[PDB]
Amino acid sequence: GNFKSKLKKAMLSQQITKSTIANKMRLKVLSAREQSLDGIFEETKEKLSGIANNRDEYKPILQSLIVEALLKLLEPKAIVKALERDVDLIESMKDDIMREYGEKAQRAPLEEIVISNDYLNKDLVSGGVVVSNASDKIEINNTLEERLKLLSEEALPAIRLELYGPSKTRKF
Amino acid sequence: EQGFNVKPRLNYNTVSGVNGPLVILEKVKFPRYNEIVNLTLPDGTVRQGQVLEIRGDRAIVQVFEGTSGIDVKKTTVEFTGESLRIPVSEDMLGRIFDGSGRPIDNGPKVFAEDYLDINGSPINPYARIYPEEMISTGVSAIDTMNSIARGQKIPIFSASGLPHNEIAAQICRQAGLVNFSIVFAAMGVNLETARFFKQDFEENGSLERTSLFLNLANDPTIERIITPRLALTTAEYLAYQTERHVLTILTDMSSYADALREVSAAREEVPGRRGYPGYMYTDLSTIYERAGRVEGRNGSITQIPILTMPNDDITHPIPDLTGYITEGQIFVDRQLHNKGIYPPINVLPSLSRLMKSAIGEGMTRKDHGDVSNQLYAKYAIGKDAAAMKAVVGEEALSIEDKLSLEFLEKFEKTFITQGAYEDRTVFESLDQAWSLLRIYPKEMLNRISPKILDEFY
Amino acid sequence: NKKAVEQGFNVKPRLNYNTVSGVNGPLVILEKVKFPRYNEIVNLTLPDGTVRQGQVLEIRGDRAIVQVFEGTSGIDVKKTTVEFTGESLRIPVSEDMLGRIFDGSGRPIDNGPKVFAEDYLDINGSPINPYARIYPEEMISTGVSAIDTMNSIARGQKIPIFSASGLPHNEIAAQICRQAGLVRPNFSIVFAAMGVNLETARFFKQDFEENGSLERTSLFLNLANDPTIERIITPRLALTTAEYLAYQTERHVLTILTDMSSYADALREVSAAREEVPGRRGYPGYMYTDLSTIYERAGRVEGRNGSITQIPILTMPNDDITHPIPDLTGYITEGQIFVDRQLHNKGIYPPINVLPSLSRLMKSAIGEGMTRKDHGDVSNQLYAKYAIGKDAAAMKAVVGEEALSIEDKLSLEFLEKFEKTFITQGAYEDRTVFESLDQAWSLLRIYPKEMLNRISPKILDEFY
Amino acid sequence: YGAIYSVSGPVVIAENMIGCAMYELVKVGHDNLVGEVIRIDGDKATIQVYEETAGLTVGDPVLRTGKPLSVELGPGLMETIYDGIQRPLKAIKEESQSIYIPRGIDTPALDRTIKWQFTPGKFQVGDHISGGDIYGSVFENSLISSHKILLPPRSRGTITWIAPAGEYTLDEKILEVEFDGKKSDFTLYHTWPVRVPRPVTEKLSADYPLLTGQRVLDALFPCVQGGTTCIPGAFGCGKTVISQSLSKYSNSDAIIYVGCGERGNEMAEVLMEFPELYTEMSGTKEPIMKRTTLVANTSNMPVAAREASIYTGITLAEYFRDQGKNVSMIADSSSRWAEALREISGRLGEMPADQGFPAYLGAKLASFYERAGKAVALGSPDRTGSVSIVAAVSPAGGDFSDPVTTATLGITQVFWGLDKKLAQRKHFPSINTSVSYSKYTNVLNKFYDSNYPEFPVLRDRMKEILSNAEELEQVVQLVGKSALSDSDKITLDVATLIKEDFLQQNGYSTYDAFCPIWKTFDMMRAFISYHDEAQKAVANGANWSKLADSTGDVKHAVSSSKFFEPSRGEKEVHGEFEKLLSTMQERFAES
Amino acid sequence: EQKNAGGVGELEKKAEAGVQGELAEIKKIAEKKKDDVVKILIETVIKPSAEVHIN
Ligand SMILES: Nc1ncnc2c1ncn2[C@@H]1O[C@H](COP(=O)(O)OP(=O)(O)O)[C@@H](O)[C@H]1O
Numbered sequence A: 001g002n003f004k005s006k007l008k009k010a011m012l013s014q015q016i017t018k019s020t021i022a023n024k025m026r027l028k029v030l031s032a033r034e035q036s037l038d039g040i041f042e043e044t045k046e047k048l049s050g051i052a053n054n055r056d057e058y059k060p061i062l063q064s065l066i067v068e069a070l071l072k073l074l075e076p077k078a079i080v081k082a083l084e085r086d087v088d089l090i091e092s093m094k095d096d097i098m099r100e101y102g103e104k105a106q107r108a109p110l111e112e113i114v115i116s117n118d119y120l121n122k123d124l125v126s127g128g129v130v131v132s133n134a135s136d137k138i139e140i141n142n143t144l145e146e147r148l149k150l151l152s153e154e155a156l157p158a159i160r161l162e163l164y165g166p167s168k169t170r171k172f
Numbered sequence B: 001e002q003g004f005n006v007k008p009r010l011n012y013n014t015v016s017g018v019n020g021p022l023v024i025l026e027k028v029k030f031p032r033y034n035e036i037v038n039l040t041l042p043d044g045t046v047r048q049g050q051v052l053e054i055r056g057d058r059a060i061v062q063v064f065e066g067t068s069g070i071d072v073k074k075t076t077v078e079f080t081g082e083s084l085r086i087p088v089s090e091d092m093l094g095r096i097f098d099g100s101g102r103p104i105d106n107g108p109k110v111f112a113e114d115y116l117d118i119n120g121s122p123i124n125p126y127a128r129i130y131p132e133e134m135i136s137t138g139v140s141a142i143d144t145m146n147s148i149a150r151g152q153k154i155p156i157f158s159a160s161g162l163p164h165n166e167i168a169a170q171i172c173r174q175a176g177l178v179n180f181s182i183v184f185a186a187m188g189v190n191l192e193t194a195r196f197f198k199q200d201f202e203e204n205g206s207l208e209r210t211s212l213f214l215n216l217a218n219d220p221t222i223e224r225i226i227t228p229r230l231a232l233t234t235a236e237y238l239a240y241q242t243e244r245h246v247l248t249i250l251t252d253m254s255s256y257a258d259a260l261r262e263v264s265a266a267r268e269e270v271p272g273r274r275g276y277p278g279y280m281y282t283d284l285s286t287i288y289e290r291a292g293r294v295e296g297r298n299g300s301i302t303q304i305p306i307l308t309m310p311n312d313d314i315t316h317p318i319p320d321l322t323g324y325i326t327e328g329q330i331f332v333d334r335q336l337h338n339k340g341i342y343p344p345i346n347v348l349p350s351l352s353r354l355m356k357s358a359i360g361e362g363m364t365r366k367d368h369g370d371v372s373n374q375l376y377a378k379y380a381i382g383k384d385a386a387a388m389k390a391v392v393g394e395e396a397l398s399i400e401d402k403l404s405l406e407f408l409e410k411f412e413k414t415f416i417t418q419g420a421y422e423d424r425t426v427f428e429s430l431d432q433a434w435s436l437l438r439i440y441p442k443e444m445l446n447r448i449s450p451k452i453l454d455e456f457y
Numbered sequence C: 001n002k003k004a005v006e007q008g009f010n011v012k013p014r015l016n017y018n019t020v021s022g023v024n025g026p027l028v029i030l031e032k033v034k035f036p037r038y039n040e041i042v043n044l045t046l047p048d049g050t051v052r053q054g055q056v057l058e059i060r061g062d063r064a065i066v067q068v069f070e071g072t073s074g075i076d077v078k079k080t081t082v083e084f085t086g087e088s089l090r091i092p093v094s095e096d097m098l099g100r101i102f103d104g105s106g107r108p109i110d111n112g113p114k115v116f117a118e119d120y121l122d123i124n125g126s127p128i129n130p131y132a133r134i135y136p137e138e139m140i141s142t143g144v145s146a147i148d149t150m151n152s153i154a155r156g157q158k159i160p161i162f163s164a165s166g167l168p169h170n171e172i173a174a175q176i177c178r179q180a181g182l183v184r185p186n187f188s189i190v191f192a193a194m195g196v197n198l199e200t201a202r203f204f205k206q207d208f209e210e211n212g213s214l215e216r217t218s219l220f221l222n223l224a225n226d227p228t229i230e231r232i233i234t235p236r237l238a239l240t241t242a243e244y245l246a247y248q249t250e251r252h253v254l255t256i257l258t259d260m261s262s263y264a265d266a267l268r269e270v271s272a273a274r275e276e277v278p279g280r281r282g283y284p285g286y287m288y289t290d291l292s293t294i295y296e297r298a299g300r301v302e303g304r305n306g307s308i309t310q311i312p313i314l315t316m317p318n319d320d321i322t323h324p325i326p327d328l329t330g331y332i333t334e335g336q337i338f339v340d341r342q343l344h345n346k347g348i349y350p351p352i353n354v355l356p357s358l359s360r361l362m363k364s365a366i367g368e369g370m371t372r373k374d375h376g377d378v379s380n381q382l383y384a385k386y387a388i389g390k391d392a393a394a395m396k397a398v399v400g401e402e403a404l405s406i407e408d409k410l411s412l413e414f415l416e417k418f419e420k421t422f423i424t425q426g427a428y429e430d431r432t433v434f435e436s437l438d439q440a441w442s443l444l445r446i447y448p449k450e451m452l453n454r455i456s457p458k459i460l461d462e463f464y
Numbered sequence D: 001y002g003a004i005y006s007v008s009g010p011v012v013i014a015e016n017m018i019g020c021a022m023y024e025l026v027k028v029g030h031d032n033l034v035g036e037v038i039r040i041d042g043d044k045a046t047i048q049v050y051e052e053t054a055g056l057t058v059g060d061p062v063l064r065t066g067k068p069l070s071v072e073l074g075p076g077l078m079e080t081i082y083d084g085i086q087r088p089l090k091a092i093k094e095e096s097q098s099i100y101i102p103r104g105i106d107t108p109a110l111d112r113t114i115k116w117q118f119t120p121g122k123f124q125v126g127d128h129i130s131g132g133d134i135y136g137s138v139f140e141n142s143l144i145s146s147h148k149i150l151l152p153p154r155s156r157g158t159i160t161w162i163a164p165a166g167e168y169t170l171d172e173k174i175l176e177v178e179f180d181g182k183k184s185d186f187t188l189y190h191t192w193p194v195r196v197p198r199p200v201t202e203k204l205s206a207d208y209p210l211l212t213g214q215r216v217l218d219a220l221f222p223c224v225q226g227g228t229t230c231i232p233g234a235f236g237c238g239k240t241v242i243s244q245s246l247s248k249y250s251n252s253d254a255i256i257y258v259g260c261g262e263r264g265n266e267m268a269e270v271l272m273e274f275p276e277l278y279t280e281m282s283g284t285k286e287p288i289m290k291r292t293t294l295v296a297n298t299s300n301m302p303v304a305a306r307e308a309s310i311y312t313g314i315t316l317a318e319y320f321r322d323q324g325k326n327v328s329m330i331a332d333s334s335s336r337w338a339e340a341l342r343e344i345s346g347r348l349g350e351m352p353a354d355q356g357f358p359a360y361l362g363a364k365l366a367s368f369y370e371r372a373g374k375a376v377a378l379g380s381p382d383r384t385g386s387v388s389i390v391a392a393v394s395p396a397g398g399d400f401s402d403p404v405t406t407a408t409l410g411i412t413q414v415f416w417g418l419d420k421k422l423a424q425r426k427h428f429p430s431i432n433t434s435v436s437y438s439k440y441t442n443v444l445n446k447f448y449d450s451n452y453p454e455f456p457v458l459r460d461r462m463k464e465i466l467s468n469a470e471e472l473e474q475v476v477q478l479v480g481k482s483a484l485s486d487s488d489k490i491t492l493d494v495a496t497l498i499k500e501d502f503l504q505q506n507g508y509s510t511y512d513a514f515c516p517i518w519k520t521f522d523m524m525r526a527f528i529s530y531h532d533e534a535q536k537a538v539a540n541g542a543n544w545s546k547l548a549d550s551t552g553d554v555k556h557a558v559s560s561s562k563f564f565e566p567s568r569g570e571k572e573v574h575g576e577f578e579k580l581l582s583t584m585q586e587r588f589a590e591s
Numbered sequence E: 001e002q003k004n005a006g007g008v009g010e011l012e013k014k015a016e017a018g019v020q021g022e023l024a025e026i027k028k029i030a031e032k033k034k035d036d037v038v039k040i041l042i043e044t045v046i047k048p049s050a051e052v053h054i055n
């Protein structure tokens, strides 16, 4: 009985040795796609920083990001937190932003749009803004890095459909 | 081409209350019910949460990872704006995930094929197929006496200390028709049980087609609410959108319902029996009713929710309501386990609502249903006569009662008793059952039809 | 010398609050309080001039919920003036207490003067440091065979008496007090009556007078007609007096807490008055904590020659030990003495059932030096053979006497000669531990040497 | 610094306290009572103060410490007694010169005056060091030698400076780590939050048995080193003496004796007895107290501190597991921990759930028992410690239907059910063989095949004998013993012999204080061989009454096998048992 | 049986040989579709989505 149990144990330990080798090789393939995926977002982050450095096509983008965050807050006052580079642009387009919020929200225009003395991290944030509550409680991290993170979380099935063909074993 | 859309989320930092497992916000802008939020602790670690209730501005959020360490001033709650969507894929099979769906197998985050809501959508009853395809579980007490049809929500009722884990692992190992994908959902089980299930699947070669959602006793307790829904939406994906045959093995649904009671008790709601939420029937129905076959699909979800009766009591709310929703049960008996019978399945409280459809008339064999009825009748007579002989002595027991006592002994000892790794085909189990029934004279066998009795005795 | 009394010469004026916001049950919700203490005992003055003491149980912002011991009947919101003392309930303790009779609230009902306080100690006390404890290893020869040979009381033990309504629990505890003495060479009893009737209180007082103990006993009588809320503080006052006497004056104090069933009943009534957890059988979920704060005040401490021995007399509501009061008391205390109705109706005195009884301090205080070397083995063998006798009696009642084996017949004979000779004593017959051990060895000599499987071979060879 | 708003028993709602985290520790009152935040309702922060609450006024300050309840780990605890919040009771007594626990006393958890002999580890300057790595060892006492000084978990980096060999106290720096340019200074100790379990590399399936010393516990229902255990029973059943007899005579390299809701006299007995007891481990007779630290929370101490005592004890056990010692933590009453939780919940006003126990009681018990387990320590060098949690549940009324008992049975693997019927009549240990079980029976087959191959077969035979006798006695109590066959007579007689000699083990007698595994195995061999010889001789045709009358000598020799002193040694005792079997076969052959 | 159990390293190398086949396809697909995926991601990130809540 001990020999039979040892044979069964050796037979059972034989399958595990093949199973562990199979799982490790299958996870290497899965981690290859995630490594290829991260290369896309790493290349996308570099391209996003290029859009911020244009300073000519960034102003239409930068104004849109504030209005997009302002329309979500839906309050007459806000505290825009932008990079130290963008403060001049924000102060230049404050009036246009207030008018756009007044027009896009079908409500009286923004009362005031304060630019916080505190600034975003230069290295961490490629561009964008972080529009916050008048009390600085409710904030919208509308930065380009945060938007890219949200896109990487959301559009992952679409990215898979773009890179690879539709799954062969997915009937419906 | 949907999904390519960015919607910035509202960080709040307006937490107003932490009452046990719940977190209350105070100034949410248009709060959405059953919404997922991402709490950012003062330490920097992120805990997910689900909006349980909403007021004009408040939003009671239940944190899945627990509320320990949640400050009121430096805790920021970010509203994702959508109910919990698990990223499912065909490559999700073969991986191990935490209670919240986060992989714990030292592998990459699952490369999403689609984002499926945990609650799913209620299948149209007109779109369901009646499950009439029996599964040969290898166990005699199940293949013969309470048959499981491919697409049945048949739980395992076992008290603490009983080998329900061993029985369910045996069923998973040997569950062919008279290959299955397994979606195992650990909820509050100990590391010993989790290691047992994982190692058994690895030894039997099931990891290639098993997705374990392990939520151990060490893991937080509010994640027991979320684990079975993730496992069942994974099973629904694999079985309806990829046309596989899935065997969902939710374990410790008693632990899940205890997590429900803890969540309900923090909300000061009107309680049910033993303090459980009044809507526990609804939650258990939402979880159990995610099993069966649909018309257009060639796939199935076989559900075997292991369930721990707190004190070996069927009348307890968890086993009661589950009996109500599920369609059967496999009652594991502490008395049988103490007697040493494996599997210690007590066939009297055990039941299978789909036996009458999946058994007999050419599906398995002409004698299956009659033999099962006769076995149940004789086992009940044996139990009653053994009680009568213990109370009022052996004189009260008649010849039929003595025969029933002998049959019960030879039935528990030789028919129910079956060591693990022993595959008893339904035909072999029926032959053994007939050998057990030949103890009785042909006349005394009551429920057996005359034709079957003449053809088989 | 003693600088503690130096701070005594200080006057602390007390705020008189007329702001009784509301009254409900035993509680008064009193608002506009200036920094309420959590456990201050207030002197509540009724409109009729009556003064009832009460202690705050909960304190919100400028709001204190006072529970009054005498009860809230007659309390008014316009006229009742509440005078916050600013300190917890402190009992004036002195060596002059020994020989006096006190009410449930600590006031003297002995028709004598108020206690000339030597110190004021909080009745709730403080937990004794477990490192400061000394394990009680000094056996007390109470003169009762069932309590000295089968069980054994060491000096700082907590050893209650579990009994029912009609059993002679008072008589047995009175026998222990009048016979208690160190086995290998006096106790200053402190008696706490909670909810007992006048007959029981007079019985205990007259027994102390007869035995000559009243010169060294303090009686805290809370009769059945006394307020129920102060049955909570009566054992606290008695045990604070005992703690003072023992640990400071270096005395050995017996503490008799009669009707801890009544104490637990008052506790349950107070808990149910509030919206508190029902525990089991309605008793509060913290009843273990309260009964422990009562019981665990007994014992011996390191560096001090005093000790406290507790014998809480407990009335079992339905003669079952699974009731919450007996169960929690058995969990907390270091044993129990079980007075049995099945033996009282049989006519045995003391009607102590040995099987349910227990003394957790028998291992220590039983040995070759503290007592005779055979004590532990003899006690274990007597327990085993008594249980065999009970089983043989049941089997005889079932299947007649003939079916019993030789061992069963011997065990029935031992059961008869044990209940009728060993357990049974006179009300004033005190048996030395060696006398009771000789009787026990006779009862074991009923058996052959082979069947005495509990006794160690050396003990059996040297004593059989 | 907040202010107290509401006080009701052990809970204290404190106002003007914005910024308090969950389960953080606050110093409530002027005496700095240790507390823990349970709820944060706006600026209010409900606090469970771990000390006596009487005397707290509205408006008293409440300092926010900023850290959770942190047990202070390091050299020093070995032979100490703690107060649930890890306040050394000896130091408290010496500092206060009283017999009581002062309110708000702030004595250090680990004595700082003591100088420790630190010997540097394999790690040198420049070597990357991670959490749990042993960068040095200190000699604590003769029994716990080379108390490995572990780097705190969650701390990593390169060693900028490591102190050389010498004598250091706990305040002195021992090692300096630079991580991300920020130098971190490390000493002999480090604090770890009790709520968060100490990390390990990988928990393992426990295979080596925890030798309790009790015959029934070792044989019938064994427990492995690293397995959760449970001892339910009424009062007087023996669940405290089993715990003490397991903390004295087990093979565990260390003991964490935790008393929650227990008598102070019990812990005083431990203090008086353990120094006088000695263990043969480490190659010398060192006192037991040199390897057991105590977390004493007497039943009259503050209610809220019982959870703190449980968590402090389990974190000490996890720390010694991380050092690599097969520790076994012994909670005196998880039942009283549950009662403390129920009291706190009821004071909070939470929903009663079952019997008043809060609905999270099962989850907390499951987490605490999941803290156990044999595990490879987090850092290098490789080592495999264990924490064998053996907690004595104390169900109310002696009924195993209590919610705490049911949850503990769900989470644990060994169930040492105590029967009060056997607790009476001095049948100790009072283990109820019918309901008790051990799920480590199968996993111990490797150890048994290695050391005592026939041991599982013998325990199966003993279980069969006991179950058969239970059934036969249930029959006999109703239908008399006359109708039984001779085989049934033998079964009942040998099972009475087993219950009265083998299973019952007096824990205070010299011979049966510690019955080791080899003596237990030999005793099982003797009893099973006696049963088999009686069965065979009666099957040959001998009348059982005359056979018993003849072989009473052999029966009494078997019944006297208890008295063989284990102090005589493994060889001498085995020689006495070998002659017993030879003297048994000859007597049965003669008759 | 132990002698027959030998060869795990050879089995691991054989399994890695099959994995190396799919990695080349993964890299080729990534290199081919990187431009398109990055262009879509950039357009989506910088695209304006100014809109108030429906309620
Ligand atoms: N194995 C044993 N050997 C000797 N005496 C025992 C044993 N078990 C219990 N006892 C006796 O029972 C008494 C109470 O047991 P204890 O440890 O207090 O159990 P519990 O804590 O459950 O009440 C002890 O004082 C001891 O004298």
Ligand SMILES: [Mg+2]
Pocket (backbone or CB within 6 Å): D239, D240, D262
């Ligand atoms: Mg105890």
